[PDB]
Design a binder for this molecule. Structure first.
Ligand SMILES: Nc1ncnc2c1ncn2[C@@H]1O[C@H](COP(=O)(O)O)[C@@H](OP(=O)(O)O)[C@H]1O
Ligand SMILES: N#Cc1cc2ccc(O)cc2oc1=O
Ligand SMILES: N#Cc1cc2ccc(O)cc2oc1=O
Length: 288
């Protein structure tokens, strides 16, 4: 019940996900797999739903066949009495959509060797930190988040589940130079979802009629996804996620970090961020 993170090769993980790495060593990627890769709270569920709808050719009834966590196996997932990502994967027909948050240091080598297409989604660090603080409260496999101030301090040094946001978004950006990676930003998807759905279509090599793309924009909207029981995580057991503490589909906005960060926290965070992000060519928008 709120166990401590377990470190594996330098990365702090949920203890059950660290145990899941064992069976995951026997995982074999196929060349037509597609991997959705994100640091937590950056738009994983959102891009999973858009990808699954594309894969069903826009058919909303087919997307309702099961919750998003069953349609898109979470590779390192495990929790007591719930089937593991690996067990769910065995029944998943190809072409498969796969989800992970693992740093490159832990990622199954077979996904790089097979040259599997990666949709990566990054989000600005300050909205990730606020989103992640609330998530820690409702998703009970995490350690106690503590106060917002104390969790922010852990976030800045990467002492949270899956480690450093700074290292994650930079290493996957570097990976995109030598591996097929479509690198998206949450904030771009908020600004123009149609434009980003069109880019994902081109990446996976499908085209769909314009009326179908407009239909997907509407069904992958925050409001539609908050009330869809197949995407909003409300079917998972209460002992694992408690939506009365914080909903999974919480606010869905870019820039709302500004009502949580104090001025002092923002000053400290901005000076730390400039050092961490100095050599990187990425640039994030903090608001629209
Ligand atoms: N269709 C959508 N549009 C915008 N944001 C969405 C969304 N679906 C989920 N989100 C937001 O993405 C975050 C969850 O990300 P992940 O799926 O990677 O865990 C939450 O952010 P907030 O906590 O800021 O509201 C969630 O509300
Ligand atoms: N009940 C239940 C379940 C919850 C659940 C949560 C997350 C996940 O990745 C996969 C999951 O599979 C399940 O069967
Ligand atoms: N229990 C539990 C869960 C933990 C969890 C952690 C990260 C994540 O991206 C999705 C997740 O879904 C879950 O059901």
């Amino acid at each position: 019940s709120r166990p401590p993170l377990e470190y594996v090769k330098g990365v702090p993980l949920i203890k059950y996900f660290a145990e899941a790495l064992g069976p995951l060593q026997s995982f074999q990627a196929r060349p037509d797999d597609l991997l959705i890769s994100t640091y937590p709270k950056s738009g994983t569920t959102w891009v999973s739903q858009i990808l699954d709808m594309i894969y069903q050719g826009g058919d909303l009834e087919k997307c309702h066949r099961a919750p998003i966590f069953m349609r898109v196996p979470f590779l390192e997932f495990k929790a007591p009495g719930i089937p593991s990502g690996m067990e769910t994967l065995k029944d998943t027909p190809a072409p498969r959509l796969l989800k992970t948050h693992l740093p490159l240091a832990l990622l199954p080598q077979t996904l790089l060797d097979q040259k599997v297409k990666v949709v990566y989604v990054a989000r600005n660090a300050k909205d990730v930190a606020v989103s992640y603080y609330h998530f820690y409260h409702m998703a009970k496999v995490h350690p106690e988040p503590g106060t917002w101030d104390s969790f922010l301090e852990k976030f800045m040094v990467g002492e949270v589940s899956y480690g450093s946001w700074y290292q994650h978004v930079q290493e996957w950006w570097e990976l995109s130079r030598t591996h097929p990676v479509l690198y998206l930003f949450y904030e771009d998807m908020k600004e123009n979802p149609k434009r980003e759905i069109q880019k994902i279509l081109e990446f996976v090599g499908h085209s769909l009629p314009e009326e179908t793309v407009d239909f997907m924009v509407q069904h992958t909207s925050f409001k539609e996804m908050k009330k869809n029981p197949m995407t909003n995580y409300t079917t998972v057991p209460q002992e694992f996620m408690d939506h009365s503490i914080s909903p999974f589909m919480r606010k869905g906005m870019a820039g709302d970090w500004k009502t949580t960060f104090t001025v002092a926290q923002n000053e400290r965070f901005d000076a730390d961020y400039a050092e961490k992000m100095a050599g990187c060519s990425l640039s994030f928008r903090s608001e629209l």
